[PDB]
Amino acid sequence: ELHSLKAAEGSRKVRNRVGRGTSSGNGKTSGRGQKGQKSRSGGGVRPGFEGGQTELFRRMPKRGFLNVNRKEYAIVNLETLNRLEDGATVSAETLVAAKIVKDVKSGVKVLANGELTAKNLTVKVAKVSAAAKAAIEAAGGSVEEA
Amino acid sequence: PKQKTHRASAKRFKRTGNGGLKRFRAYTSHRFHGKSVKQRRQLRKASMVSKGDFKRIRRMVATM
Amino acid sequence: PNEGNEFAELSARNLENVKVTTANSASVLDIVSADKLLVVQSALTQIEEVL
RNA sequence: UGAAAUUUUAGUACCUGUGAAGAUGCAGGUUACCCGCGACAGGACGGAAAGACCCCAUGGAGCUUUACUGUAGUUUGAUAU
RNA sequence: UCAAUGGUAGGAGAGCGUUCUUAACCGCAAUGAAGGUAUACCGUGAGGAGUGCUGGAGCGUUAAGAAGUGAGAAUGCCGG
RNA sequence: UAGCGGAGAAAUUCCAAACGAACUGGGAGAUAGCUGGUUCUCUCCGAAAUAGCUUUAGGGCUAGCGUCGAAAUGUAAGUGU
RNA sequence: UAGUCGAAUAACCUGGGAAGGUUAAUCAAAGAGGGUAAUAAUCCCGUAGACAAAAUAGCGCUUAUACCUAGCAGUAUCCUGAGUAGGGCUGGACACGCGAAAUCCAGUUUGAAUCCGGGAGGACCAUCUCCCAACCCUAAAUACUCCUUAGUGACCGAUAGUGAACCAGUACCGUGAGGGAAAGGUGAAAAGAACCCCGAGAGGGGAGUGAAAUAGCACCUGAAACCGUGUGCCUACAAGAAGUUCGAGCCCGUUAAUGGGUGAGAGCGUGCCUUUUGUAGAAUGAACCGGCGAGUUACGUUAUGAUGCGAGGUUAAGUUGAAGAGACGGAGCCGUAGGGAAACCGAGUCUGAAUAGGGCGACUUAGUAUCAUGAUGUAGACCCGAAACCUAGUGACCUAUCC
RNA sequence: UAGCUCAUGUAAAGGUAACGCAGAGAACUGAAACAUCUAAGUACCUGCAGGAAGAGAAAGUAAAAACGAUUUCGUAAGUAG
A60 interfaces chain B, CB cutoff of 8 Å: yes
Containing A123, the helix (H) or strand (E) segment is strand A122-124
- H-type helices in B4-58, by residue range? 7-10, 37-42
| Separation between Cα atoms, residue C46 and residue C51, nearest integer Å | 9
Q: CA angle, corner A69, sides to A63 and A73, nearest 5?
A: 105
Per-residue burial over B5-15, b = 16 or more CB atoms within 10 Å of its CB, e = otherwise: eeeebbbbbee
Contact C2, C23 (CB under 8 A): yes
What DSSP letter does each residue of A72-85 carry, written as one string? Answer: ------SHHHHHS-
Which nucleotides along chain H are within 7 A of a protein C-beta? Answer: 31-32, 77-81
- Total residue length of chain C: 51
Q: How far is the CA of A116 from the C1' of G77 (A)?
A: 75
In angstroms, rounded to a whole number, what is the distance separating the alpha carbons of residues A138 and A112?
A: 11
Mutate to test the interface with A, among C32, C36, C37 (most CBs of A within 10 A): C32
Please tell me which chains touch A, using 3 or more CB pairs under 8 Å as the contact test: B, C
Find the residue in C nearest to A4 (Cα): C32
| Nearest-angstrom CA–CA distance, A125 and C19 | 59
Q: How far is the CA of A53 from the C1' of F67 (A)?
A: 31
How many angstroms separate the CA of A28 from the C1' of G202? 59
- Cβ-proximal residues to A103 (8 Å cutoff; 6+ apart), any chain: none
User: Which residues are CB-neighbours of B46 under 8 A, at least 6 positions away?
Assistant: B22, B23, B24, B25, B28
What's the DSSP call for residue B55? G
H-helix segments, chain C: 28-34
How close A55 gets to chain B, by Cα (Å)?
Answer: 10
- Say whether the peptide bond before residue A86 is cis (omega within 30 degrees of 0): yes
User: What is the spatial distance between Cα B51 and Cα B21, in angstroms, rounded to a whole number?
Assistant: 11
User: Between the CA atoms of A56, A57, A62 and A63, what dihedral angle is there, to the nearest 10 degrees?
Assistant: 90
This PDB structure is determined at a resolution in Å of 5.6
Q: Does residue A144 sit in helix, strand or coil?
A: strand
